Ligand binder design. Structure first.
Ligand SMILES: NC[C@@H]1O[C@H](O[C@H]2[C@@H](O)[C@H](O[C@@H]3[C@@H](O)[C@H](N)C[C@H](N)[C@H]3O[C@H]3O[C@H](CO)[C@@H](O)[C@H](O)[C@H]3N)O[C@@H]2CO)[C@H](N)[C@@H](O)[C@@H]1O
Ligand SMILES: [Mg+2]
Ligand SMILES: [Mg+2]
Ligand SMILES: [Mg+2]
Ligand SMILES: [Mg+2]
Ligand SMILES: [Mg+2]
Ligand SMILES: [Mg+2]
Ligand SMILES: [Mg+2]
Ligand SMILES: [Mg+2]
Ligand SMILES: [Mg+2]
Ligand SMILES: [Mg+2]
Lengths: 125, 118, 50, 203, 106
RNA sequence: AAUUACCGAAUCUUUGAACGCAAACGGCGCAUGGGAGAAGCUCGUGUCAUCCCCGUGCAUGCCAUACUCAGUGUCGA
RNA sequence: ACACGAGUUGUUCGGAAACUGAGCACAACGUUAUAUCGUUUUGUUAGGAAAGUGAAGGUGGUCG
RNA sequence: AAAGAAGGUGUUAGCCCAUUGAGCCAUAAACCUGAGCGCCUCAUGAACAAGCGAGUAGCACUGUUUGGGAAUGCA
RNA sequence: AGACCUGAGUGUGGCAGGACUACCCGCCGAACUUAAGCAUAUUACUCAGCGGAGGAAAAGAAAACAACCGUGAUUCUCUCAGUGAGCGGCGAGCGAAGAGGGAACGAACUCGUUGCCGAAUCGGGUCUUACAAGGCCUUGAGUUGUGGCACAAAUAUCAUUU
């Protein structure tokens, strides 16, 4: 029956997606009254296709909010006020670890000795 | 500073700056229109419930257990175009919260309960 | 008595909703194992003590 | 050089001038807290020897420990069993107080990786040690090649495991030859090695 | 080679005087007697030992001859295989070249 | 628009190191923002007093930092 | 007992919001190899700058 | 049969089924390849008389630890 | 007035806290047992207790072994060696190291000091597709010293354009 496919659901705006969310929370709420007052097994039984299509509208609304907010903090030099829900979640230990732009830092002498005496490729016969 | 008239040195009040308001910490939509479908769940249809619709004026619903009586009245206005004058909530031994909702005597209880359908 | 915390009332409410038998159509599935409920608590035999 | 005058002045610790300065210092240190942060180290010649630089993420704390031996904490001095284990007062801890001072800093200020400390001053009751710590999240410390090793998470509490200089003292790792054969790399690393009943396969 | 070149050193303790084995590295006097920079020799496959003292000329000349043999077998590929910089391979040598798994470098 | 397996995008109640304060309390704050609002006021709309919801900031210690201070500490006009 | 279906309605009732008591022990401070230890109401924390409240007045839109 | 492989199927399966090979297809980074390969930018290899770790080491007493004994290590 | 020093208060950006804990590092630390009793000794520098990491940890680059024709960081293995070592009511019992055959191994480097330089440094801004080992700017730290060059594998300093 009524079943929001997501391909025709990602082309909606933020206002029409909310207007069809109130449409489908309302249709679920007036099937919770037929689930308590008897209920034919055909009218009841549209409880999964509504409740999983509410889950499709909310995952289009939420994936369009993180997309339009990740492209609000990586745009410029505002990346110190980026909220931590939008940052790259790794292991806790991997965020504190030395990045590889760091950790290969070396002395002016340590650069010289790898330039004055570099490791040669060679063979033997 | 100067003019120390008390026997002990209490802390002088420096200038103290307010804290910045952060932009956001939640990335999730929350529709204010669907927000009262979680307050009101479904009506009861028991024998004590059917008697109170006819004889007193009241309607009976399972509501969510973490709502107060004020926000149940406001959900019985936006969902159902009726006026609640009195809500008497009750957390059941089942674990659910049941509300008895008396209408304003400008609104018929059966005319609302046919539109809901029960 | 009358005094209970609501967190004790909501634990006592879960055990009332668990004290229901196995339905009959469970006994008709393919790889069935369950005849009876093995956890039917009675208020006199065994005490929860919440 | 300027170090050589500072270093040889701190070898004259018993002379009348350095006994005056340590007199004043030991007065004003026992009217401070157990753990005190300084802007600059009290001995800059000995702090930089030991690893401190006047960089951004380095920081020095002066830590106080009490002197004397270890009273065994048995109840009422009553202990049981064999008479060799009966002593309460003459027993002595197997960690020096410099290590104990470094562990009291780093168990208290958890976000800081302490490297080693040094002796500052004695009293009849207390000893003081400036413990050099370093902030591993400071951008100066992460980008600097000769100190960025401290940011790696194997150095998290070097003090609690005996990896500082004062830790390596009470482990016996000042010695290498026949004077340390029972204790290289560890006493437990040699106990396990010398006592595990090896079962060769074909035997 | 899978294993770098190691010197021939004697064995200590008069039980083992008449024996020889492979040392840690060539001293920086056997290397200079072979006309070879010790910092440069570590890149072209030679182990170097700054600690060993060379207390006789027979034990020094054995390991110089190991270095003189090794450099004549050495091929030493170019950095840039178009612009050859020094005495290096000539790509008829940088294509016929092989390695050993001879378990000692011998 | 099957179903299953896998995984990158998300959701993830109340708690718990648990950290606004508490706690056999589904309890109570101080700033701040949003909401709903049948009394009022407005020329039924707006606006909306308390009341009532919802988000965020706020444990403590420390490191770095950019402003307000204390000191018969040493100076200095 | 067993199965099924119900049943606990609050401005004022009891509690909390919101009291103090015997006491407890968070912060602070000290101790301890170790905090999982001590002190913490005899008016009362802490070598101990823990009051963020504001009388009166000055500054300039409102009511006699 | 380059496949005999050992699981399933109503009763003992190489032939009933799945398997058991050569290889095909698709890949966020990372990994590996004349330190893969260009461009920009940026570094820079080779040519042309002084001293070196001080409440430290040691020593004494005590305590412990060790095969370490006129004292192995430590406090 | 102002400064410097030593301390506060807030703002901003961060971090520590608990879990696991087989192995590993630091401490703490027994007794039953054995000695045909038992107290030294043994069990055992083990169990239990407390703290702390990692994918391993710890060790590691000679204030080493040797006494040789010498060896050459650490770790591990077989052996040394249940020892004509040693310790021990010299009782019960305990207990190694060097050498040699191997595993691994591109294995080495960084400060401090000294000498020569002296902010050439670091952080924040900002501009280059860029939180550049880039420019340019900053009293913000810093001269109570950040950085560079040389120090046994050494043959030394600055230029510069090839
Ligand atoms: N026959 C009795 C059994 O012997 C078994 O062990 C027997 C053998 O397995 C064991 O042999 C051991 C060998 O396993 C171990 N890996 C090394 C040892 N060299 C051998 O021992 C051998 O040499 C010794 C003298 O050196 C002889 O006394 C002994 O008889 C001989 N088997 O010695 C025992 C003599 O037969 C078990 N210990 C046990 O099941 C049981 O006591
Ligand atoms: Mg050994
Ligand atoms: Mg809480
Ligand atoms: Mg019953
Ligand atoms: Mg001494
Ligand atoms: Mg922990
Ligand atoms: Mg036993
Ligand atoms: Mg017996
Ligand atoms: Mg244990
Ligand atoms: Mg390591
Ligand atoms: Mg320097």
């Amino acid at each position: 029956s009524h079943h929001m496919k997501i391909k025709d659901l990602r082309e909606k705006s933020k206002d029409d997606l909310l207007k069809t969310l109130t449409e489908y929370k309302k249709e679920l709420s007036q099937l919770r009254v037929v689930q308590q007052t008897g209920g034919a097994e055909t009218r009841l039984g549209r409880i999964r296709p509504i409740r999983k299509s509410i889950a499709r509208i909310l995952t289009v609304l939420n994936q369009n909010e993180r997309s339009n907010l990740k492209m609000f903090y990586a745009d410029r030099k505002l990346r110190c006020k980026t909220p931590k829900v939008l940052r790259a979640k790794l292991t806790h230990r991997r965020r504190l670890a030395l990045k590889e732009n760091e950790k290969n830092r070396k002395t002016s002498r340590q650069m010289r000795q790898a330039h004055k005496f570099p490791k040669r490729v060679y063979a033997v016969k | 500073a100067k003019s120390y008239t008390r026997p002990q040195f209490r802390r002088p009040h420096t200038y103290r700056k307010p804290a910045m308001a952060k932009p956001s910490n939640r990335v999730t939509v929350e529709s204010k229109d669907i927000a009262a479908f979680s307050v009101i769940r479904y009506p009861l249809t028991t024998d004590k419930a059917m008697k109170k619709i006819e004889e007193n004026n009241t309607l009976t619903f399972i509501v969510d257990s973490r709502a107060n009586k004020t926000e149940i009245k406001k959900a019985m206005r936006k969902l159902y175009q009726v006026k609640a004058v009195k809500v008497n909530t009750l957390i059941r031994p089942d674990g659910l919260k049941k509300a008895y909702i008396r209408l304003s005597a400008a609104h018929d209880a059966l005319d609302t309960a046919n539109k809901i359908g029960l | 008595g009358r005094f209970k915390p609501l967190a004790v009332k909501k634990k006592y409410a879960k055990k009332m909703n668990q004290n229901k038998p196995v339905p009959y159509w469970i006994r008709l599935r393919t790889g069935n194992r369950i005849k009876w409920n093995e956890k039917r608590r009675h208020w006199r035999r065994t005490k929860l003590n919440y | 050089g300027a170090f050589m005058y500072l270093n040889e002045l701190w070898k004259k610790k018993s002379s009348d001038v350095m006994r005056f300065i340590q007199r004043i210092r030991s007065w004003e240190f026992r009217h401070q807290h157990t753990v005190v942060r300084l802007r600059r180290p009290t001995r800059p010649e000995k702090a930089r020897m030991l690893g401190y630089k006047t960089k951004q993420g380095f920081c020095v704390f002066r830590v106080r420990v009490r002197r004397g031996g270890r009273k065994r904490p048995v109840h009422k001095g009553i202990t049981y069993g064999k008479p060799k284990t009966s002593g309460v007062l003459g027993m002595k801890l197997n960690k020096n107080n410099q290590a104990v001072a470094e562990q009291r800093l780093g168990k208290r200020f958890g976000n800081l990786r302490v490297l080693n400390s040094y002796w500052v001053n004695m009293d009849s009751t207390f000893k003081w040690y400036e413990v050099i710590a370093v902030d591993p999240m400071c951008k100066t410390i992460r980008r600097d090649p000769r100190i960025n090793w401290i940011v790696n998470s194997v150095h998290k509490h070097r003090e609690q495991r005996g990896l500082t200089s004062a830790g390596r003292k009470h482990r016996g790792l000042r010695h290498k030859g026949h004077k340390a054969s029972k204790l290289r790399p560890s006493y437990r690393a040699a106990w396990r090695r010398n006592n595990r009943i090896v079962f060769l396969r074909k035997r | 080679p899978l294993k770098a070149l190691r010197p021939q050193v004697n064995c200590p303790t008069v039980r083992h005087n008449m024996k020889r084995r492979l040392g840690r590295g060539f001293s920086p006097a056997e290397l200079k007697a072979a006309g070879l920079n010790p910092q440069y020799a570590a890149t072209i496959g030679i182990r170097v030992d700054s600690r060993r003292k060379n207390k006789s000329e027979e034990g020094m000349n054995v390991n110089v001859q190991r270095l003189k043999t090794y450099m004549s077998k050495l091929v030493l590929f170019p950095m840039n295989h178009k612009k050859v910089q020094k005495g290096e391979a000539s790509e008829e040598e940088v294509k016929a070249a092989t390695q050993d798994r001879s378990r000692f470098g011998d």
